[PDB]
């Protein structure tokens, strides 16, 4: 006689908390911004940002990836 | 005689909390922004942003990916 | 006679908390910013940022990756 | 021959969240309270409270009680 | 022959979160309280409280109580 | 022959988080309290409190209690 019992159990947790969480910002204050430009020249792509206060959260990450394999094989 | 019992159990959790979460902003204040331009020239694509206050959340990430395989095989 | 019992149990946690968490910022204050530009020339991509206060959280990381294998084999 | 295996598993949760939780109160404003008392008589206990704004959380409850008994008995 | 295996497992949680939790109060404002008392008489205990703004959290409760019994008994 | 393997496992958690926790109070304001008392009489104990602002946390409770009896008994 042969008996095989195959009963792996998974109760595990996987978790990511990525970015800005639970922070307090109280009266954050951008000052005056002046940009003055004259007679400039450009011969390729210009990417420009101007501003008094920028608050930015950027999250390419925090991804979860679970790979699981089971392979009971007999004779 | 042969007996195979194949009863893997999955109760596992996967979670992502990506971006800006639970934050408090109290009276965030952008200042005056002045941009002045004269006699400029451009010969390729211009991307421009101007503003007093920018609050931004960008999340390309936070994706969950579960891949699972079972392969009971006999003779 | 043969009896095989295969019962691995997983109760594990995997966790990441990446970025800015639980911080307090009280009256953070950007100063006056003045940019004055004249007769500049550019032959390349221009990437430009100007601003009084920038608060930035960038998280490419904090990803979780679990790879798990089971391979009971008989004769 | 006799074999007895006694392996109850407990993974249970018990939880109470009693009182005031997660509320927001914005500018709650008690009015003017004026009490004028004259020529009174009291012949037993006086218990007295006077006030403009009261926030009160009282929790006599929210208790958790787990009673667990195991009694394997043989002949 | 006799074999007894007695291996009960407890992984359970018990938790209480009793009182005032995670609340936000923004500018809560008690008003003026005026008490004027004249020619009064008292012939037993006086308990008295007067005040403009009261925040009170009182927790006689929230207790956790685990009672656990094991009584393997043989012949 | 007789064999007894008494090996119970406890991995359980017990926890109380009683009182005031994680709250935010921004500029809480008691108003003016005026008490004027004239020609009074008291013939037993006086307990008295007067004040503009109170913040009271009182926790007679929140206790954790565990009782755990093991009684392997043989012939």
Swiss-Prot record, chains A, B, C, D, E, F:
Omega-N-methylarginine: residues carrying this PTM: 45
Glycyl lysine isopeptide (Lys-Gly) (interchain with G-Cter in ubiquitin), cross-linked positions: 7, 13, 17, 27, 39, 43, 49, 65, 71
Modifications the protein undergoes after translation, according to the UniProt entry: Phosphorylation at serine and threonine residues in S-P or T-P motifs by proline-directed protein kinases (PDPK1, CDK1, CDK5, GSK3, MAPK) (only 2-3 sites per protein in interphase, seven-fold increase in mitosis, and in the form associated with paired helical filaments (PHF-tau)), and at serine residues in K-X-G-S motifs by MAP/microtubule affinity-regulating kinase (MARK1, MARK2, MARK3 or MARK4), causing detachment from microtubules, and their disassembly. Phosphorylation decreases with age.
Site (Not glycated): 7, 13, 17, 27, 36, 39, 66, 71
Glycosylated residues (UniProt): 43, 49, 65
Tissue: Expressed in neurons. Isoform PNS-tau is expressed in the peripheral nervous system while the others are expressed in the central nervous system.
Tau/MAP repeat feature ranges: 2-32, 33-64
Modified residues (N6-acetyllysine): 7, 13, 17, 27, 39, 43, 65
Post-translational modification Phosphoserine, affected residues: 1, 20, 48, 52
Effect of residue 33 to M: In FTD1; ultrastructural and biochemical characteristics indistinguishable from Alzheimer disease; accelerates aggregation of tau into filaments
Modified residues (N6,N6-dimethyllysine): 7
Outcome of mutating residue 16 to F: In PIDB; markedly reduced ability of tau to promote microtubule assembly
Domain of life, per lineage: Eukaryota
Notes concerning its domains: The tau/MAP repeat binds to tubulin. Type I isoforms contain 3 repeats while type II isoforms contain 4 repeats.
Record: disease: In Alzheimer disease, the neuronal cytoskeleton in the brain is progressively disrupted and replaced by tangles of paired helical filaments (PHF) and straight filaments, mainly composed of hyperphosphorylated forms of TAU (PHF-TAU or AD P-TAU). O-GlcNAcylation is greatly reduced in Alzheimer disease brain cerebral cortex leading to an increase in TAU/MAPT phosphorylations. Frontotemporal dementia 1: A form of dementia characterized by pathologic finding of frontotemporal lobar degeneration, presenile dementia with behavioral changes, deterioration of cognitive capacities and loss of memory. In some cases, parkinsonian symptoms are prominent. Neuropathological changes include frontotemporal atrophy often associated with atrophy of the basal ganglia, substantia nigra, amygdala. In most cases, protein tau deposits are found in glial cells and/or neurons.
Assembly behavior: Interacts with MARK1, MARK2, MARK3 and MARK4. Interacts with PSMC2 through SQSTM1. Interacts with SQSTM1 when polyubiquitinated. Interacts with FKBP4. Binds to CSNK1D. Interacts with SGK1. Interacts with PIN1. Interacts with LRRK2. Interacts with LRP1, leading to endocytosis; this interaction is reduced in the presence of LRPAP1/RAP.
Annotated function: Promotes microtubule assembly and stability, and might be involved in the establishment and maintenance of neuronal polarity. The C-terminus binds axonal microtubules while the N-terminus binds neural plasma membrane components, suggesting that tau functions as a linker protein between both. Axonal polarity is predetermined by TAU/MAPT localization (in the neuronal cell) in the domain of the cell body defined by the centrosome. The short isoforms allow plasticity of the cytoskeleton whereas the longer isoforms may preferentially play a role in its stabilization.
Listed name of the protein: Microtubule-associated protein tau
Natural source organism: Homo sapiens (Human)
Boundaries of the shown chain within the full protein: 622 to 696 of 758
């Amino acid at each position: 006689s042969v008996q095989i019992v195959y009963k792996p159990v998974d109760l595990s947790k996987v978790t990511s908390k990525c970015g800005s969480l639970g922070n307090i910002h109280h009266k954050p204050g951008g000052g005056q911004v002046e940009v003055k430009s004259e007679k400039l020249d450009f011969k390729d792509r210009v990417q420009s940002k101007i501003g008094s206060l920028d608050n930015i959260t950027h999250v390419p990450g925090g991804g979860n990836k679970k790979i699981e394999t089971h392979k009971l094989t007999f004779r």
